[PDB]
Design an enzyme around this catalytic site. Structure first.
Site, PDB file in Angstrom:
ATOM      1  N   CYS A   1       0.869  -1.171   0.000  1.00  0.00           N
ATOM      2  CA  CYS A   1       0.000   0.000   0.000  1.00  0.00           C
ATOM      3  C   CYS A   1       0.907   1.222   0.000  1.00  0.00           C
ATOM      4  O   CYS A   1       2.109   1.124  -0.264  1.00  0.00           O
ATOM      5  CB  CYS A   1      -0.976  -0.033   1.186  1.00  0.00           C
ATOM      6  SG  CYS A   1      -0.207  -0.061   2.788  1.00  0.00           S
TER       7      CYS A   1
ATOM      8  N   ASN B   1       1.909   1.247   4.508  1.00  0.00           N
ATOM      9  CA  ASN B   1       2.184  -0.010   5.205  1.00  0.00           C
ATOM     10  C   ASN B   1       1.884   0.118   6.699  1.00  0.00           C
ATOM     11  O   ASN B   1       2.584  -0.446   7.540  1.00  0.00           O
ATOM     12  CB  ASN B   1       3.628  -0.471   4.971  1.00  0.00           C
ATOM     13  CG  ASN B   1       3.872  -1.907   5.414  1.00  0.00           C
ATOM     14  OD1 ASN B   1       4.842  -2.193   6.114  1.00  0.00           O
ATOM     15  ND2 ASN B   1       2.994  -2.814   5.006  1.00  0.00           N
TER      16      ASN B   1
ATOM     17  N   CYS C   1      -1.904   0.674   7.421  1.00  0.00           N
ATOM     18  CA  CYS C   1      -3.320   0.331   7.479  1.00  0.00           C
ATOM     19  C   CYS C   1      -3.658  -0.883   6.621  1.00  0.00           C
ATOM     20  O   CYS C   1      -3.838  -1.988   7.144  1.00  0.00           O
ATOM     21  CB  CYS C   1      -4.182   1.517   7.043  1.00  0.00           C
ATOM     22  SG  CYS C   1      -3.897   3.047   7.950  1.00  0.00           S
ATOM     23  N   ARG C   2      -3.755  -0.689   5.304  1.00  0.00           N
ATOM     24  CA  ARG C   2      -4.287  -1.733   4.434  1.00  0.00           C
ATOM     25  C   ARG C   2      -3.390  -2.966   4.423  1.00  0.00           C
ATOM     26  O   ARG C   2      -3.827  -4.068   4.773  1.00  0.00           O
ATOM     27  CB  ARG C   2      -4.472  -1.184   3.017  1.00  0.00           C
ATOM     28  CG  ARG C   2      -5.709  -0.302   2.844  1.00  0.00           C
ATOM     29  CD  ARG C   2      -5.631   0.518   1.569  1.00  0.00           C
ATOM     30  NE  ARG C   2      -4.478   1.413   1.582  1.00  0.00           N
ATOM     31  CZ  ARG C   2      -4.060   2.118   0.537  1.00  0.00           C
ATOM     32  NH1 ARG C   2      -4.696   2.038  -0.624  1.00  0.00           N
ATOM     33  NH2 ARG C   2      -2.998   2.903   0.653  1.00  0.00           N
ATOM     34  N   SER C   3      -2.127  -2.802   4.030  1.00  0.00           N
ATOM     35  CA  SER C   3      -1.300  -3.970   3.754  1.00  0.00           C
ATOM     36  C   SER C   3      -0.948  -4.747   5.024  1.00  0.00           C
ATOM     37  O   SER C   3      -0.842  -5.980   4.965  1.00  0.00           O
ATOM     38  CB  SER C   3      -0.028  -3.565   3.004  1.00  0.00           C
ATOM     39  OG  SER C   3       0.724  -2.611   3.718  1.00  0.00           O
TER      40      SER C   3
ATOM     41  N   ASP D   1      -7.681   3.614   1.062  1.00  0.00           N
ATOM     42  CA  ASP D   1      -6.972   3.920   2.294  1.00  0.00           C
ATOM     43  C   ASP D   1      -7.949   4.384   3.373  1.00  0.00           C
ATOM     44  O   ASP D   1      -8.611   5.416   3.189  1.00  0.00           O
ATOM     45  CB  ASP D   1      -5.925   4.997   2.026  1.00  0.00           C
ATOM     46  CG  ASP D   1      -4.997   5.213   3.201  1.00  0.00           C
ATOM     47  OD1 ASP D   1      -5.274   4.662   4.288  1.00  0.00           O
ATOM     48  OD2 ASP D   1      -3.989   5.934   3.040  1.00  0.00           O
TER      49      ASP D   1
END
Lengths: 153, 153
Positions: free
Chosen positions: A9, A12, A14-16, A126
């Site tokens: 993302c 690195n 939140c999402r990933s 995000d």
């Protein structure tokens, strides 16, 4: 043997980290974790050195995931040691397609994680400027995509 | 102003993640954690994409330590960005000194974590080939050494 997947993302945090944690849990539940090396990384340097976003940690606690990360930036070697690079949005796909065309070895396949979503929701957006529910949304996307991705192996 | 340290071992699943989380705790206890960038990495690539050894994950759990890590390999840019690279054994040190002379810009001071030991246990032996008590010994070493290191600066 071993298959390798890197979730990417922007930051690195939140999402990933969530995608990483969800895929690790998913290969543990299926008893396939011995054959998977899993990591996550950032396209940018903004949040390197930081732990996951607490909304993400608490979201992972909600589903019994033992998330465990420190944010790092993607490297040149990641394009060689990882079989799949799965990103969240077109912007990540754009940046990673650029660096993939500028590297000494490029083993990895560079795809959107959302391109595996049965529900066809293409972008994992995000959630950093949202609330706790924006994080649950992302976890559901990641879980759906991670299950499809695993199925197709 | 802001300081930073990288803990390095062979695979980044045993000693260095412990050292990383031990140090992160005792800077938080000292209320100086805003001024530190803390991380760990591996000299090799074998364990990359793995979480820390579950034994160490248990050792940290027993001392109330929140270990949050996936293994990664040290990079060119780690030598350039980190003020300190504290490693475990002469092999790490040997390999890090060589890589340090093979990058264009090396900010990092490469030392053995154990060189800070008031007990003078200079090498933090790899506990991988042992039992849960071998991880307790590494922890106590990291505890001694990290304190003495923070007290240096």
């Amino acid at each position: 043997g071993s298959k390798s997947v890197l979730f990417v993302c922007l930051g690195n945090i939140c999402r990933s980290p969530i995608a990483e944690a969800v895929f690790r849990k998913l290969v543990t539940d299926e008893k396939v974790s011995d054959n998977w090396r899993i990591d996550s990384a950032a396209t940018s340097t903004y949040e390197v050195g930081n732990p996951p976003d607490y909304r993400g940690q608490n979201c992972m606690r909600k589903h019994g995931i033992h998330m465990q990360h420190i944010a790092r930036q993607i490297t040149k070697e990641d394009f060689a040691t990882f079989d799949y690079i799965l990103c969240m949005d077109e912007s990540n796909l754009r940046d990673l397609n650029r660096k993939s065309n500028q590297v000494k070895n490029c083993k990895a396949k560079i795809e959107l994680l959302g391109s595996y979503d049965p529900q066809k929701q293409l972008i994992i957006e995000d959630p950093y400027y949202g609330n706790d529910s924006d994080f649950e949304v992302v976890y559901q996307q990641c879980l759906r995509c991670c299950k499809a991705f695993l199925e197709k192996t």
